[model samples]
Target: MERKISRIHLVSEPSITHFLQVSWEKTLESGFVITLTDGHSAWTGTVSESEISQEADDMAMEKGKYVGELRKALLSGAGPADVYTFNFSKESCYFFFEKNLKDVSFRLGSFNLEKVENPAEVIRELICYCLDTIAENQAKNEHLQKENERLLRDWND
Candidate 1:
């Protein structure tokens, strides 16, 4: 049988915390932006854009390659484990990970935790249901637009 794969965009603080608790091995680290994406996906990195772009002519690497390297480093125990720190301020937020978080935009409001099972599947279902609702709304909007155009033409005639 083929395995069913799914994805979720996590945003809420409670949801994020729950995901971390379930997915990560607890450590002493704190106050970092932790993003979880597929090891194969392109949205992996440590530093933020503003930091890297600050240099007059610094070249930046793609998020996926950066994250892939970080993952490799972590697995090899070549250096300190990749760390993430997150700061939510009134006007903006800052995310600091051991690697740049460029591909993390795909993560959006929260991280995209993929191919999860059990309780994770529960979360994935919730997200899919929400997406279905969004699709319904879009269809409704299209219908309303067509109706409005028809009404305008009738009035003009």
Candidate 2:
């Protein structure tokens, strides 16, 4: 399929996160639509820069400066990363990042990038993902607790 690159960047996480956090709002204000998908369901809407900024805050003046640099690179357009190579098209975007020094690829697309929507489904899907994660973590904790008790019993013996 024919694809074109509008803006791209290759940077580290929290940094790129901040840059995207800032730029997303800029783009949204300029009437650009952001469409994200989790393969099965898709969400399209304007991003809340404030929300992003608050989360991003959890990760800084130094960070703030780097994010601005990323904003500059974003305007520069598509490029090349082990750090992270992000490619953005008019209709879609993909990313490659490292996981414990291993490589991974993530992609999301939109059937209609120009069509803005409520994005309710996206938040719904987010809740679904969160619930699954919470359950998994709780299960792991229970297992760890059992293991700890077992070890304590052995220690007493």
Candidate 3:
């Protein structure tokens, strides 16, 4: 008897919330703030809803600048810790700085930072994970719909 190989389809989702939460806790347990050139700053604090939007906008600007610095460091072949300071977003209360490869580690302030080698790849994978979860949910919905139709047909008979 010959056995046939079966293809496996697995659905997975990247919990962005979990990632953000963990990263926040790991970096900002003591609470720290970073001030930008624009005189705006980022730190963890309780604020009103009206202030949140302004804070978010500032954070976006800070994050963009940080990412740009990170890109420069990578192009220069700098080690992880040297490039780590550029990994965080201003909108978030937590900040990370480091570029840790297998052997070398970059340090920023008190935290040991590791630079993400391929930021684009990580983002692409995250998106794919979300898509897979959506597809799985759709399949479940279709199964329920068929069952409902069958029940209705039997009731009419």
List, residue by residue over 63-134, the lDDT tens digit for candidate 1. Answer: 444434433322222336442332222123332223325454221122222332344545454457557667
Output the lDDT of residue 136, model 1: 85
Q: Show the lowest summed lDDT stretch of 10 residues, model 1.
A: 22-31
**Native-structure RMSD, model 2:** 16.8
On lDDT, the leading prediction is 2
Which stretches of candidate 2 lie above 4 Å from their native place?
1-81, 90-118
**Pairwise TM-score winner, candidates 1 and 2:** 2
Best candidate according to TM-score: 2
Q: Per-residue lDDT of 22-46 in model 3, one digit per residue for the tens?
A: 1111222222221211112112222
Candidate 2 CA-lDDT value: 0.38
lDDT of each: 0.34, 0.38, 0.35
Q: TM-score of model 2 relative to the true fold?
A: 0.34
Q: Give the runs in model 1 whose Cα sits over 4 Å from its true position.
A: 1-117
Off by over 4 Å in 3: 1-115
